[PDB]
Ligand binder design. Structure first.
Ligand SMILES: CC(=O)Nc1nnc(S(N)(=O)=O)s1
Ligand SMILES: [Zn+2]
Length: 222
């Protein structure tokens, strides 16, 4: 079933597009969120074990995704190890800090060995060109499709050395809006060109951020 960010199948209507998408409207622990008030807590430190891999670059209609057909890129937090599957982008950002929307956001999507999902998010301010992303931007499929990149890509370069994060629980930001997703949002921001942002939008065909959702019961730790 088709869905999107504009027109008549937009995010406020995702719930009634089918029965399997119904948590997009009835869920109480949904992403993204406006992080406004937090609780200052002793969060467990992130350990990134990312290395170069032979990735491919896909345009799936809704985003530009970079898929990892093997394990090997992991991140460890609080004892559990999480395998990176794919990372991808929203322009503009989905999550907000104090009502601030950033020109782009990245989502590094993982499963531990229980299939318990974790999203690690990087936020992009407007700034100089992103040298480390230009490898992906060059081959970026400008319609639905897939290119195997034939030079190794290193996702370690897309994460900061300073790894403080905001921690909450949430959902996918795309249908079926499944819950049980751990959200870690990094505090140190990366940077993108105005042109890299336009180009993404040109490829994907729209602004691909879901509107922010109520926190309800949820507390955000920082
Ligand atoms: C099948 C699948 O993996 N779907 C998703 N992955 N990441 C998502 S996002 N916008 O929540 O981070 S939705
Ligand atoms: Zn996403």
């Amino acid at each position: 079933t088709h869905w999107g960010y504009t027109g008549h199948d937009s995010p406020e209507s995702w719930g009634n597009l089918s029965e399997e998408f119904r948590l997009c409207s009835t869920g109480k622990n949904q992403s993204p969120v406006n992080i406004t008030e937090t609780v200052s807590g002793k969060l467990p430190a992130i350990k990134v074990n990312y290395k170069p891999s032979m990735v491919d670059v896909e345009n799936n209609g809704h985003t530009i995704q970079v898929n990892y057909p093997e394990g090997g890129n992991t991140l460890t937090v609080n004892g559990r190890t999480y395998t990176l599957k794919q990372f991808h982008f929203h322009v503009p950002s989905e999550n907000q800090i104090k009502g601030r929307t950033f020109p782009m956001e990245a989502h590094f999507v993982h499963l531990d060995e229980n299939k318990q999902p974790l999203v690690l998010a990087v936020l992009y301010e407007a700034g100089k060109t992103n040298g480390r992303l230009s490898s992906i931007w060059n081959v970026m499929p400008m319609t639905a499709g897939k290119v195997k990149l034939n030079q190794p890509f290193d996702a370690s370069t897309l994460l900061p050395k300073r790894l403080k994060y905001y921690r909450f629980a949430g959902s996918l930001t795309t249908p079926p809006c499944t819950e049980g997703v751990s959200w870690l949002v990094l505090k140190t921001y990366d940077h993108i060109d105005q042109a890299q942002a336009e180009k993404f939008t040109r490829a994907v065909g729209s602004e691909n951020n879901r509107p922010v959702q109520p926190l309800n019961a949820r507390v955000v730790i920082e």
